[PDB]
Design a protein around this ligand. Structure first.
Ligand SMILES: CC[N+](CC)(CCCCCn1c(C)cc(=O)n(CCCCC[N+](CC)(CC)Cc2ccccc2[N+](=O)[O-])c1=O)Cc1ccccc1[N+](=O)[O-]
Ligand SMILES: CC[N+](CC)(CCCCCn1c(C)cc(=O)n(CCCCC[N+](CC)(CC)Cc2ccccc2[N+](=O)[O-])c1=O)Cc1ccccc1[N+](=O)[O-]
Ligand SMILES: *[C@@H]1O[C@H](CO)[C@@H](O)[C@H](O)[C@H]1NC(C)=O
Ligand SMILES: *[C@@H]1O[C@H](CO)[C@@H](O)[C@H](O)[C@H]1NC(C)=O
Ligand SMILES: *[C@@H]1O[C@H](CO)[C@@H](O)[C@H](O)[C@H]1NC(C)=O
Ligand SMILES: [Cl-]
Ligand SMILES: [Cl-]
Ligand SMILES: [Cl-]
Ligand SMILES: [Cl-]
Ligand SMILES: [Cl-]
Ligand SMILES: [Cl-]
Ligand SMILES: [Cl-]
Ligand SMILES: [Cl-]
Ligand SMILES: [Cl-]
Ligand SMILES: [Cl-]
Ligand SMILES: [Cl-]
Ligand SMILES: [Cl-]
Ligand SMILES: [Cl-]
Ligand SMILES: [Cl-]
Ligand SMILES: [Cl-]
Lengths: 536, 536
């Protein structure tokens, strides 16, 4: 009976498990419920705090994954399957995980809260790439990661109705943050130093906790990796969420008996449908044929988001905020194989000019004819307009800039203009273990392995250079979470990382070579996306 | 008494003058009338062939300059004054000049016909930069240059009328070309090798002789230097020419007193106006505040131009044609000091961003609001949007690319696609003797000094390197006129000047350094001007 693995929180006693990290033991508490299961008549509704329990509740193991669509495109392929659920799917998914050094730290340790991505349609904190034993052991951090509801279950909304108010997955996240506030001191964490960091939709979620006043008192510093609250895919209007919800209900046969305009009857009918009945029709409600669009995402309800994210970042007061943002080299690459015809992971995806034009219509689905013409003009090389290599790479660049890079640049420019301290990176290193094809470069979400320190595991067959690289990145992130600055205090000789500013526009490259400072994150192109195309 | 200077043409006998070129004598016949003077009742009317004369006509001096505006902006400044009329101004201007070697050539010599520029409001063949003695002495060419009516006197049009059909300055040029066809064998020229070459409006004129079918039997090869028949400034619609002509008539106090109506009466009244009255009022009729816009230019009458120049170059068959086209480094440089505020030749001309926006509204005067926004987007550097130097150069680039470079790129592309043999250049060398300020670079029309071989004159204080440069350029031009190819027929690894094609898009740089082959003349930017921008 180990006294370090027995911890009492508000709700009751917890039993953890001692895990072996490469450099020493860590304490893990996995599957701590922070909310009553959102099942039955709780579906689509905001979460309620987990009722206290009796005896010792077992957290030695990851709990179930929130119910979600599962990626079937390339069965058996490590590239997709690494992101697929590694546990049972259930609507009783609201649980969080805690990693602490062994033993508990003598003094309160800054806390890191990871919010996973997946486009608000998928993901779990039990995935191997989110393993927090390396950060906890090496940098002494207390790392928390929670499961939140995704897809319809988290985001199906009938705006204005009480039964399906929308954004309840964000409310799951917020409840996990309040749980960290109340209970994290018992694990050795400091509730007064709390850094949220996330990738893809998780990153967007982080931004939204910045823009929602009730969430601002639950965290101090924030990191957005390859995602933003603003931009094309991360939010939907009230009317659009009503359209998608009503259409999905229509596909599952809801409501019955003469239909009507009763919202309580529609959501009452939906709450009796098996989860998979909803997931079956999840993708059918997208308004246009598209990639990098997700059916059920945060809605602008005038509640959790008091206004649109763009308006909130434009007019906000960010004076006391410290943000770290960045992108990867090719953000849009693998999205192309998800239904832009001519693109596959098993060949070079050399495409014709017509295939590139159609690809623009899919990858920028909300673009008008004139806006698509502008995108084609901008991304075409008119010395080699037919060159299939440049057409393919330029398609990847269109998707990546549109959905990620340019929204990140917009967010960093706005936050820096409004008084925030912003740090910007671009992750250029392709993992030696990557199973995706060569032409896709560094794809969406492939920096996460190194931030969490997976290369420090020698059994994972990384390179030694990737091990020291991962250690350096863990130093950057942990330094940021601790001091609000990624640079190592005192030090120097280790070229400094300047803050991103409006005048200088300085960002750094994260790769095997030492830190290289650059100016102008896709400056001309993102001026086109962020400035011109709106006028069209 | 000189046996070489007495020459008989179809109209009568003429006696020329022996001139001293730096390396030997040449024969000059200057002021040969090719047309009955377009004076009195013949104003605005097409030219009539010069009726035969008695005696020996004096060829030894330049004749009058066509009545035209005189540049007052910078009095005493060589930069502007070198283009001003150097002879008496008169409405009886129609005369041409012939240069041949001394003695006159034994066997028929390929003929070069120069059509001067000046935006169809100005110019003359008597200017020092158009002096043909160097091409006659050094390269043995027979060079002809003619005066044609400019301004109201050649281009004022009431389309469809008998009394002022429009384009009579172009008909002046054509009549000179027909005269050359009949009479040039008397001077030793070869009527079956005739190369038109011109600059600015002259270049445009050349292009229109290509697109006008009656002019097609008077020449073989063409050279267009910094001008095109297509594009914003070189043509006006029938209705616009009628609008400008009627407005001018009313401004000179010539309705007479009701409005308008009978075109015989409007033109009859307009013919009673002093020449300087017309010149005084000619700039009043420009529809918007603008630079690089000229009031009276060729009109699309459905007669000389069967269709718009863009239409004719898109649908034409050029299969037997040989064209040489090119631009200079900064085309729009000195247009900016003509009333874009903030631009003068006496300072570094560093401008603010607001001055750049207004400057785009002036330099692209027919652009809509959205089109101007697009121009400002494209030409702004978004790493240094406020940098005054980049904004000044960018303003120059807007005017240059809009009026010259991109029209040349469209013409080159269309002629190449439809089967012409196209050679393309970019003139990068700034004359050491240039009086315009440093920031203007190589301005509009400053390659002509070198093409005509003026640096071979030692009194003009050029460099030796510019002597060699001028010689090399004269060899390219006369090689093209002779063979339809600029390249030295007997040579290898000079290197070679390749023909412009749609696939390769190869052009050469003309400067002090040896020929450098480049691809993609203003490829992306002119893709913006020619392809996208129209759709707004
Ligand atoms: C239509 C087939 C249905 N569809 C459509 C569409 C569309 O965009 N997608 C999703 C494609 C995204 C890439 C797939 N994942 C694996 C499941 C990356 C390898 C998901 C992912 C992982 C990590 C972060 C973010 C994501 N993400 O954005 O989806 C589609 O399936
Ligand atoms: C008293 C002056 N007014 C009344 C008659 C007229 C003002 C003169 C016109 C000013 N202007 C404008 C407004 C636009 C424009 O594009 N240009 C052409 C100038 C380009 C350069 C001129 N040159 C030297 C002579 C080059 C150095 C000639 C040249 C040489 C070789 C190739 C090509 C050229 N070229 O193309 O010109 C221009 O001159 C006053 C008045 C009255 C009513 C309305 C407006 C005015 N005003 O605006 O001044
Ligand atoms: C919706 O249905 C419930 C139960 O059938 C009913 O009590 C309620 O009045 C209905 N709402 C409306 C607006 O008809
Ligand atoms: C690559 O594979 C995809 C799917 O198998 C196919 O649609 C595409 O035509 C292929 N591309 C090439 C260049 O063979
Ligand atoms: C123009 O005016 C004259 C006046 O002598 C008149 O005879 C003639 O018919 C008029 N032309 C037209 C087309 O009306
Ligand atoms: Cl283990
Ligand atoms: Cl269980
Ligand atoms: Cl949006
Ligand atoms: Cl196209
Ligand atoms: Cl769009
Ligand atoms: Cl690009
Ligand atoms: Cl008369
Ligand atoms: Cl002869
Ligand atoms: Cl036009
Ligand atoms: Cl019109
Ligand atoms: Cl601006
Ligand atoms: Cl653009
Ligand atoms: Cl540019
Ligand atoms: Cl074109
Ligand atoms: Cl310059």
């Amino acid at each position: 009976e180990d006294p370090q693995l027995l911890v009492r929180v508000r709700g009751g006693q917890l039993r953890g498990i001692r895990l072996k990290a490469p450099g020493g033991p860590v304490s893990a508490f996995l599957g701590i419920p922070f909310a009553e299961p959102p099942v039955g008549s709780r579906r689509f509704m905001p979460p309620e705090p987990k009722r206290p329990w009796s005896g010792v509740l077992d957290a030695t193991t990851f709990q179930n994954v929130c119910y979600q669509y599962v990626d079937t495109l390339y069965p058996g392929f490590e590239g997709t399957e690494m992101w697929n659920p590694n546990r049972e799917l259930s609507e009783d998914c609201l649980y969080l995980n805690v990693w602490t050094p062994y033993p508990r730290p003598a003094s309160p340790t800054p806390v890191l809260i990871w919010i996973y991505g997946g486009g608000f349609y998928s993901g779990a904190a039990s995935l191997d790439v989110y393993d927090g034993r390396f950060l906890a052991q090496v940098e002494g951090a207390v790392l928390v990661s929670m499961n939140y509801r995704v897809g319809t279950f988290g985001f199906l909304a009938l705006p204005g109705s009480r039964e399906a108010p929308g954004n309840v997955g964000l409310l799951d996240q917020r409840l996990a943050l309040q749980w960290v506030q109340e209970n994290i001191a018992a694990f050795g964490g400091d509730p007064m130093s709390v850094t949220l960091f996330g990738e893809s939709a998780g990153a967007a979620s982080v931004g939204m906790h910045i823009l929602s006043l009730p969430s601002r008192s639950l965290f101090h510093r924030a990191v957005l990796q390859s995602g933003t609250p603003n931009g094309p895919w991360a939010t939907v209007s009230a009317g659009e969420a009503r359209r998608r919800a009503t259409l999905l209900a229509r596909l599952v046969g809801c409501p019955p008996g003469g239909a009507g305009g009763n919202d309580t009857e529609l959501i009452a009918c939906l709450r009796t449908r098996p989860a998979q009945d909803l997931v079956d029709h999840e993708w059918h409600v997208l308004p246009q044929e598209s990639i990098f669009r997700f059916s059920f995402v945060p809605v602008v309800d005038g509640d959790f988001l008091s206004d649109t994210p763009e308006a909130l970042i434009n007019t906000g007061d960010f004076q006391d905020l410290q943000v770290l943002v960045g992108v990867v080299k090719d953000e849009g690459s693998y999205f192309l194989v998800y239904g832009v015809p001519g693109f596959s992971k098993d060949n070079e995806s050399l495409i014709s000019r017509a295939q590139f034009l159609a690809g623009v219509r899919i990858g920028v689905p909300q673009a008008s004819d004139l806006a698509a013409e502008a995108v084609v003009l901008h991304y075409t090389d008119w010395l080699h307009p037919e060159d299939p290599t440049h057409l393919r790479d330029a398609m990847s660049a269109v998707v990546g800039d549109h959905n990620v890079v340019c929204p990140v640049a917009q967010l960093a420019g706005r936050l820096a203009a409004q008084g925030a301290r912003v740090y910007a990176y671009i992750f250029e290193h392709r993992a030696s273990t990557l199973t995706w094809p060569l032409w896709m470069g560094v794809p969406h979400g492939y920096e996460i392995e190194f931030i969490f320190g997976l290369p420090l595991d020698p059994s994972l067959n990384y390179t030694t250079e990737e091990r020291i690289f991962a250690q350096r990145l863990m130093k950057y992130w942990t330094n940021f979470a601790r001091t609000g600055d990624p640079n190592d205090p005192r030090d120097s000789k280790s070229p400094q990382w300047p803050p991103y500013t409006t005048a200088a526009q300085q960002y750094v490259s994260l790769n095997l070579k030492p830190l290289e400072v650059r100016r102008g994150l896709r400056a001309q192109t993102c001026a086109f996306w962020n400035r011109f195309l709106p006028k069209l």
